[PDB]
């Protein structure tokens, strides 16, 4: 029935293995501290290489 | 009485700020925001214009001809002073009575309001509406239609000081009837039917929802057509009255309730640009 | 039958009490040293003007430059941003839509709505290409895996993965509890996810199609979804006045962006390139610019006339464009 | 070179293409069906003619109506329609909706939600009293009391500005005049004159319903145009 299908799923989806958070804060943090010299949005871009003015 | 003098000055120069001021105001709330950009929206432009030019162009040089009692400029420096003065009244009063009837039609029409009038069709009426002030205006003082035969007058129309107003039987009493007595009428017809409609509607919802829990439409009534008919209403009376008869009236009193005419335009702003968005665009400016 | 209701309970307890022990330090804690980006300013390029009606949802092309926005009018108008002229306009059978995408390749548009039908139309050829139905509802969002599968997220509760060619649906994705209203796609196609009106949001994966991980941090509704550019996390938007940020990895919510001056829920949020800027467009009159790390608003973006209802950056992160309940869209830089 | 000629080009014919559009999308009213299922609203729209449209027009004016078919949160696409009409089942209050509550009061919450949706403050709706035959034999006949299912009905009155139907029994009278008041005590209690109720007496053998409902989308517009420059 439905409860099958939730009760199996809450099982299932438990299982898996969790990374410690400060490893996730560190590569987000890594990931845009490496990126952030191609955004166009974060840093004023040129006149000449702004397409839009 | 040169404290006098002086008083006048200050109140002429306040009038003139405040003119201004209002109206480009007005004119930039509409031009900044494209929210305000509406069909019926496009004849307040209009109006705001034309009370703009006439503030920045006769009542300064009409203050001046007051303090100075004589006219510095050149002789047809005045006549072109005249014909934007005539222009810009009639052009306002005119630019009144199209926004009287767009509301009319608002109201009175629900359903075909929508379609009837479009941005197009605004730009033509607008356009319309400025090309026939100009008419009454332009074509017969350039043309030296509304010169009138009296002595004196004829006599003065040559000398530099002389640029007070003279006409005759003719060109006055069309003018006045063009620029004031018939928007005057059908503003005064579309009044009453939209009067009659708002009533028919307040008695339909009392009938409808009256147990459970005309004063303003009133109110608004009288702040539209109150501030323009005692503003206009006792120059073009006297118009016709000292050009019907000569010495009917003297000239202080033409002066002065012309005057009050032009100082109508100071209300117009107040009194239709008025609705909340204006406000809340006035709060965003200040 | 109750007996099995005590289990369901257990497991929740014991996935709860998994996700707190992994969680050492939030955070904001790391990010604390730290620089903030300051004030970020942004102007109106452009504004394209003609749409009849209140824009719903807008999806950049493949490149920087197209735009394809869907509007209560019955048209969809794809615009050239570089030059703000209109490229093509499509009418619909259905006058009241919800959604629009547009393909990587650039050649298909889908358009969904209150009409349960899936509509995708050939822009390189306007025809109909394929209306596809089974759908019990309204279709909130939907998105292109490639030229010739899609995602969308119906109001049935249910996500559905298409076929375009066979017209379809090859996998269904269910368990929400309430309507989707949102879905957003990895930088692969191997992982999407939905978040429904419900307090969940819950990570899908193709390959299988069975839900993988499933946060409720919210209180309220979700009305947006994006990824974060790597695909490694991803941020939702409420009706609650909270835009909230999770980890995939971590399984849990990182951090929460409020702030006591709005109220208002939150109706579009993504991601700027290199993830550093969260632009969410507020049920207000205006948009707000939110650091990613932290939660500081560096921007605010004003001048729509109403409720502003999509948001979206360019692939290659050059600028964003709004689309508000007012008839004009909106490209700031 | 020649492509800016093209976009051109292109724009042009889409610009008129789309003047034409709004001209003709301004021309027509929207309307929204939003009524119970029990309610026979399926009869009422035949009777006017995923998601069913209908056309219909009167005075050369153009009225599209919808009917859609939980919590809803579809009701935000209807931000901007000329009206919504409800459709209520008067004969409604013995019977109870399956799995039990009153279907009519099932109704007055559903209006309740409505009118103080945040995004349908404006839009005024149009009440129709659905099969009024049913109500008046119910309360004519049988054993079936208003106050012992709606406790309010023992103190209520029929009003004197009240004006019944010609040839009405007083009973009948009473009841849907309190099933209206009830309606309308839910619509004025809110509101700060945008949006307004129209109750609305109706029958499947009466034919005249699609000129109340012109009438009352006009009464809609003048009103709505009235407030806008304060007249009203
Ligand atoms: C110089 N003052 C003029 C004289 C006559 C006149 C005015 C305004 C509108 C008209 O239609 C007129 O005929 C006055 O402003």
Redesign the pocket.
């Known amino acids: 029935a439905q409860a099958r299908k939730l009760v199996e799923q809450l099982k299932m989806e438990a299982n898996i293995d969790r990374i410690k958070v400060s490893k996730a804060a560190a590569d987000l943090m890594a990931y845009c501290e490496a990126h952030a010299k191609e955004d166009p949005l974060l840093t004023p871009v040129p006149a000449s290489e702004n397409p839009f003015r | 009485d040169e404290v006098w003098v002086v008083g006048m000055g200050i109140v002429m120069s306040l009038i003139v700020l405040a003119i201004v001021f209002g109206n480009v105001l007005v004119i930039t709330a509409i031009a900044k925001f494209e929210r305000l950009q509406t069909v019926t929206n496009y004849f307040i432009t209009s109006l705001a214009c034309a009370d703009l030019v006439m503030g920045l162009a006769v009542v300064p040089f009409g203050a001046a001809h007051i303090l100075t009692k004589t006219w510095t400029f050149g002789n047809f420096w005045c006549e072109f002073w005249?014909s934007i003065?005539?222009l810009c009244?009639?052009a306002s009063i005119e630019t009144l009575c199209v926004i009287a009837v767009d509301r009319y039609f608002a109201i009175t029409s629900p359903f075909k309001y929508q379609s009837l009038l479009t941005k197009n069709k605004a730009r033509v009426i607008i356009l319309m509406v400025w090309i026939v002030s100009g008419l009454?205006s332009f074509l017969p003082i350039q043309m030296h239609w509304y010169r009138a035969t009296h002595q004196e007058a004829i006599n003065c129309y040559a000398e530099e000081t002389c640029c007070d107003?003279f006409?005759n039987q003719a060109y006055?009493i069309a003018?006045?009837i063009?620029?004031?007595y018939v928007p005057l009428v059908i503003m005064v017809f579309v009044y009453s039917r939209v009067f009659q409609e708002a009533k028919r509607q307040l008695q339909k919802i009392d009938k409808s929802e009256g147990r459970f829990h005309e004063h303003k439409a009133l109110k608004t009534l009288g702040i539209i057509m109150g501030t323009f008919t005692l503003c206009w209403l006792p120059f073009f009376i006297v118009?016709i009255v000292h050009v019907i008869q000569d010495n009917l009236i003297r000239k202080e009193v033409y002066i002065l309730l012309?005057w009050i005419?032009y100082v109508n335009s100071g209300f117009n702003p107040l009194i239709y640009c008025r609705s909340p968005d204006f406000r809340i665009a006035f709060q965003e400016l200040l | 039958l109750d007996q099995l209701r005590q289990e369901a309970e257990q497991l929740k307890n014991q996935i709860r009490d998994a996700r707190k022990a992994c969680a050492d330090a939030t955070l904001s804690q790391i990010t604390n040293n730290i620089d903030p980006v300051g004030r970020i300013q942004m102007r109106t390029r452009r504004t394209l003007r003609g749409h009849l009606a209140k824009i719903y949802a807008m999806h950049w092309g493949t490149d920087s430059r197209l735009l394809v926005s869907a509007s209560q009018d019955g048209k969809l108008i794809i615009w050239d941003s570089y030059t703000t002229n209109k490229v093509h306009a499509i009418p619909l059978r259905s006058s009241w839509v919800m959604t629009c995408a547009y393909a990587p390749s650039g050649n298909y548009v889908a358009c969904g709505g209150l009409d349960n039908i899936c509509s995708i139309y050939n822009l390189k050829t306007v025809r109909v290409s394929r209306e596809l139905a089974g759908h019990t509802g309204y279709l909130s969002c939907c998105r292109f895996l490639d030229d010739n599968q899609i995602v969308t997220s119906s109001g049935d509760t249910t996500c559905a993965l298409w076929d375009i060619e066979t017209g379809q649906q090859t996998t269904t994705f269910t368990g929400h509890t309430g309507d989707v209203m949102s879905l957003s796609l990895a930088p692969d196609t191997r992982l999407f996810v939905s978040g429904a009106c419900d307090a969940s949001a819950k990570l899908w994966d193709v390959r299988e199609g069975m839900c993988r991980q499933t946060f409720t941090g919210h209180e309220s509704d979700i009305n947006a979804i994006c990824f974060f550019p790597n695909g490694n996390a991803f941020a939702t938007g409420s009706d609650d006045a909270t835009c909230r940020l999770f980890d995939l990895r971590a399984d849990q919510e990182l951090m929460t962006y409020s702030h006591d001056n709005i109220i208002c829920g939150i109706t579009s949020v993504s991601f700027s390139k290199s993830g550093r800027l969260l632009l969410a467009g507020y049920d207000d009159f205006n948009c707000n610019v939110w650091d990613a790390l932290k939660a500081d608003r560096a921007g605010v973006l004003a001048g729509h006339d109403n409720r502003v209802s999509c948001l979206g950056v360019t692939d290659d992160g050059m600028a964003v464009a709004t689309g508000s309940w007012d008839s004009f869209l909106k490209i700031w830089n | 070179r020649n492509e800016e000629k093209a976009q051109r080009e292109a724009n042009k014919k889409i610009e008129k293409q789309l003047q034409k559009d709004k001209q003709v999308y301004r021309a027509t009213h929207r309307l929204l069906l939003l009524g119970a299922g029990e309610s026979g609203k399926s009869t009422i729209v035949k009777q006017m003619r995923g998601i069913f449209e209908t056309k219909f027009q009167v005075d050369k004016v153009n009225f599209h109506m919808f009917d859609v078919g939980e919590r809803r949160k579809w009701i935000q696409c209807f931000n901007d329609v000329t009206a919504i009409i409800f459709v209520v089942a008067s004969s409604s209050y013995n019977m109870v909706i399956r799995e039990q509550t009153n279907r009519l009061q099932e109704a007055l919450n559903l209006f309740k939600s409505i009118w103080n949706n945040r995004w349908l403050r404006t839009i005024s709706v149009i009440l129709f009293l659905n099969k009024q035959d049913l109500l008046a034999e119910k309360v004519l006949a049988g054993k079936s009391k208003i106050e012992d299912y709606f406790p309010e009905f023992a103190r209520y009155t029929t009003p004197e500005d009240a004006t019944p139907e010609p040839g009405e029994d007083p009973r009948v009278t009473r009841a849907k005049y309190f099933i209206r008041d009830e309606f309308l005590r839910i619509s004025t209690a809110s509101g700060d004159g945008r949006h307004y109720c129209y109750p609305h007496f109706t029958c499947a053998v009466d034919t005249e319903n699609i000129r109340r409902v012109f009438n009352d989308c006009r009464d809609i517009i003048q009103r709505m145009h009235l407030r806008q420059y304060e007249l009203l």
Do not use: E, M, P, R
């Open positions: 005249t003065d005539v009244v009639t009454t107003f006409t006055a003018s006045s063009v620029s004031f118009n012309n005419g």
